[PDB]
């Protein structure tokens, strides 16, 4: 159904150790398609996908020099920010920029965003409307009065409402086999003991795309919450993902409890119990 | 693809 394109930039100052670490990546949905790293030998915007490789050295050349200029923005930012908050050159510091677009099942613009953040903290962010800004400190308000006064909002909205979608659609069909799929889960249960009158059932779910998933428990059709455990979704390496949810129960009474599993691969939700 | 507009120093 719905889709998105994203970029995630991570710039980290390393004082005394020389130039800052710069790491940019690019995602469609939950499929990483481009990346750049300073410490990698390439010094070029590489592909993480096969379908992006299609495009020859016009795409890459520009996309590289785009991303160099992204780092060179942060190089200075890091300077200005150390200025702003009045930090010493001793301590290392971190900025993170994130921008991208959204579309529904009809492949047409929902929403765009541009988040920014010093030392793991919101600093400024382009609001929902893409016309006004939002600043966390006064430090950020200064930057707001720059980013407002120099009509950044104009140039940025046009990227997110325009370019982004014209390219997200392009990338979607260009690698349709991978991006337009849906891989199902593989939900099974492994019964595991804990105490002489107690049992712990794990409702596994493996080898699925997209990451989106909802696993929960039910004792006799009652939404069981507590005495469970639910790990945050693993990237499998695979490309697909995994996610289990546990439940510690009074023993013997094992097959009262149900595992209700929502996913856009499966026709409509799954309910399982111990065999 | 990446932006070439709307990105500026802080």
């Amino acid at each position, epitope marked *: 159904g719905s889709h998105s394109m994203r970029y995630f930039f991570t710039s980290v100052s390393r004082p005394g150790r020389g130039e800052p670490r710069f790491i940019a990546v690019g995602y469609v949905d939950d499929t990483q398609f481009v990346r750049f790293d300073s410490d990698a030998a390439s010094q070029r915007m590489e592909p993480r996908a096969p379908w992006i490789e299609q495009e020859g050295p016009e795409y890459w050349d520009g996309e590289t020099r785009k991303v160099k200029a992204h780092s060179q923005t942060h190089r200075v930012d890091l300077g200005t920010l150390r200025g702003y908050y009045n930090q010493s050159e001793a301590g290392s510091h971190t900025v993170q920029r994130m921008y991208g677009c959204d579309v529904g099942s009809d492949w047409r613009f929902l929403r765009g965003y541009h988040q920014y953040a010093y030392d793991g903290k919101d600093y400024i962010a382009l609001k929902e409307d893409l016309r006004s800004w939002t600043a966390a400190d006064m430090a950020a308000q200064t930057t707001k009065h720059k980013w407002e006064a*120099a009509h950044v909002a104009e*140039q940025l909205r046009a990227y997110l409402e325009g370019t982004c979608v014209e390219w997200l659609r392009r990338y979607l069909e260009n690698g349709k086999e991978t991006l337009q799929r849906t891989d199902a889960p593989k939900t099974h249960m492994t019964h595991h003991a804990v105490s002489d009158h107690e049992a712990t059932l794990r409702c596994w779910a493996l080898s699925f795309y997209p990451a989106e998933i909802t696993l929960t428990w039910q004792r006799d059709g009652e939404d069981q919450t507590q005495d469970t455990e639910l790990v945050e979704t693993r990237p499998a390496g695979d490309g697909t993902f995994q996610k289990w949810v546990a439940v510690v129960v009074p023993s013997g009474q094992e097959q009262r409890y149900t595992c209700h599993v929502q996913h856009e691969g499966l026709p409509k939700p799954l309910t399982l119990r111990w065999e | 693809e990446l932006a070439g507009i709307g990105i500026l120093t802080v």
Partner: T-cell receptor
Framework: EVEQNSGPLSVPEGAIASLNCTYS??????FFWYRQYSGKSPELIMS????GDKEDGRFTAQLNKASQYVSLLIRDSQPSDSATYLC??????????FGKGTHLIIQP | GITQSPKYLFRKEGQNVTLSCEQN?????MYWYRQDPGQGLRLIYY???????QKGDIAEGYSVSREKKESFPLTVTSAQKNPTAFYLC?????????????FGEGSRLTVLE
């Protein structure tokens, strides 16, 4: 790489003066119209980033990234409007690439 | 604003000549173009950020610094056969070629054979 209909395309005082231009790059995200007089320094009059029209006073600029069209038409053309109009675009930290030019010469 | 000097000059062979281009707008981007009567303007160098500059179409025979954010002086060296032209400097706010390009006032040049 950004070809323009180099002229001179000439118009009388009050007649309308449309200029066209097209560009050889799908990653272009910024598009401009600078106006340069003889031996003088260029000056912006129309910047357009998104598709559709975008007017300002007597000048109107339009963008279509599908066909790669950019335009500028000058309704109510004075003789202050004479001399060379420069089409130019970019948007990939590559600098900016100017056109040949078009001498818009208004007959007084 | 942005300003460049001199508006007019030349020098003979076996010598350099540098052109100053200072701006106080607090602009990151800065570019020198040369416009040959005949052609439109061709790019020589641009400068996204301090201590960084980047090749244009005809930079071979031209040199540039960028030590402070304001000045971006183009050295024309004892190198080219056709220096003779009109040399425009400019700064933009944002990334390179992203924004306005506030131009200077040019500088005419000549081969004084």
């Amino acid at each position: 790489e950004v070809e323009q209909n180099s002229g001179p395309l000439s118009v009388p005082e009050g007649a309308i003066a449309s200029l066209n231009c097209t560009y050889s790059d799908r990653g272009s995200q910024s598009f401009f119209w600078y106006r340069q007089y003889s031996g003088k320094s260029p000056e912006l009059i129309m910047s357009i980033y998104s598709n559709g029209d975008k007017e300002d006073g007597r000048f109107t600029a339009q963008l279509n990234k599908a066909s790669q069209y950019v335009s500028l038409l000058i309704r109510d053309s004075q003789p202050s409007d004479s001399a060379t109009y420069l089409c130019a675009g970019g948007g990939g930290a590559d600098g900016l690439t100017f056109g040949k030019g078009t001498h818009l010469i208004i007959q007084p | 604003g942005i300003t460049q000097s001199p508006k007019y000059l030349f020098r003979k062979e076996g010598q350099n000549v540098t052109l100053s281009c200072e701006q106080n707008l607090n602009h990151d981007a800065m570019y020198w173009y040369r416009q040959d009567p005949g052609q439109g303007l061709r790019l020589i160098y641009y400068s996204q950020i301090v201590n960084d500059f980047q090749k244009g179409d005809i930079a071979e025979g031209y040199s540039v610094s960028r030590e402070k954010k304001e000045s971006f002086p183009l050295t024309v060296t004892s190198a080219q056969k056709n220096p003779t032209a009109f040399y425009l400097c400019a700064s933009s706010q944002g990334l390179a070629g992203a924004g306005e390009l506030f131009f200077g006032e040019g500088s005419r040049l000549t081969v004084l054979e």
